[PDB]
């Protein structure tokens, strides 16, 4: 009856706590209006995107591929520097990956975010599978928040995350 996330508010009707990563947090009630399976798939995809993005916002600051050594440790500056051909190849790779999602969303039914990618067979144990599902959701959420923060910090300081931390210019000087 009562939401776990907000103990003083009634539990959202669609969020009954059975689905992974459900703590009854929906103050604005997106689940009432929009399809819950679609919302879950979108959340999982965003979490995966942002997990990779948060990892790659910091990895070049530690090591760069020999081809892209000259590219800036600032991820935005590196994006500007990469050039149309490499970005086009990345876009084609991403579109080839997203063709499978297109097929699974519009012409198939399955667990939200299940594209059949489990090469190492880490999800066969049900208990470990449940822990991994919740962990994926929560790490994706944390990565979304962290990567949004990272993008804005790079906008402000015009530097990488580690460089900003080391130089301790944590505070803004105004709009860029």
């Amino acid at each position: 009856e009562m939401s776990k996330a907000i103990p003083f508010a009634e539990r959202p009707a669609k969020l009954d706590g059975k689905i992974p990563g459900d703590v009854g947090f929906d103050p604005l009630g997106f689940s009432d209006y929009y399809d819950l399976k679609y919302l879950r798939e979108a959340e999982i995809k965003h979490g995966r995107i942002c997990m990779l993005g948060a990892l790659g916002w910091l990895f070049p600051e530690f090591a760069k591929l020999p081809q892209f050594a000259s590219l800036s440790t600032n991820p935005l500056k590196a994006a500007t520097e990469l050039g149309p051909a490499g970005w086009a190849q990345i876009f084609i790779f991403v579109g080839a990956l997203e063709s499978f999602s297109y097929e699974k969303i519009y012409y198939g039914d399955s667990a939200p975010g299940d594209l059949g990618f489990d090469p190492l067979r880490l999800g066969k144990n049900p208990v470990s599978r449940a822990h991994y599902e919740v962990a994926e959701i929560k790490n994706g959420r944390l990565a979304m928040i962290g990567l949004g923060g990272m993008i804005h910090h790079s906008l402000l300081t015009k530097q990488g995350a580690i460089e900003q931390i080391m130089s301790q210019n944590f505070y803004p000087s105004g709009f860029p």
């Binding site: 604005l28 009630g29 997106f30 009432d32 209006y33 709009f175 860029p176």
Partner: protein, 160 residues
């Protein structure tokens, strides 16, 4: 800087300021010192000078005509020209619309809705006026709960 020059260092802006001040001083020259007309014209001169100085320091860009121009493209260096004012408007306008809609529904569920609409129930109207300050979350809550958008089969429509 975008396509124009800063107004703080524009000969055209300085010339416009000089012309305005000279017009006011010419008008002032025909009035005795300390008289209400002289005081009014001196206050006008002070206001003109303050306005021009503030415009110069605001970072506004000025064209060849010597008048400030607004860069309403989204640039954060010029947010105060259109975006932040626009956000203030949208806030106030959504406040007004939300409270008006709330009062419309309140009068709809009354004994005489038309009477409530011509002769208002100002206690309830002020209640809604107060409610209007979180209209964005309230409006989105209404939308998601389905109390905002009506179904296509429940709205009258003319024949094709």
């Amino acid at each position: 800087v975008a396509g124009l020059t800063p107004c703080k260092d524009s000969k055209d802006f300085q010339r416009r300021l000089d012309g305005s001040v000279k017009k006011l001083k010419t008008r002032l020259a025909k009035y005795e010192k300390g008289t209400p007309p002289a005081l009014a014209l001196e206050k006008q001169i002070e206001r003109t000078q303050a306005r021009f100085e503030r415009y110069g320091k605001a970072g506004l860009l000025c064209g060849t005509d010597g008048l400030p121009h607004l860069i309403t493209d989204g640039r954060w260096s010029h947010s105060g020209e259109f975006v932040i004012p626009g956000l203030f408007f949208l806030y106030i306008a959504g406040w007004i619309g939300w409270v008006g809609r709330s009062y419309v529904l309140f009068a709809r569920e009354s004994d005489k809705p038309t009477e409530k609409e011509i002769i208002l129930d100002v206690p309830a109207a002020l209640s809604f006026v107060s409610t209007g300050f979180i209209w964005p979350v309230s409006a989105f809550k209404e939308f998601t709960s389905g109390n905002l958008i009506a179904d296509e089969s429940e709205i009258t429509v003319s024949p094709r």
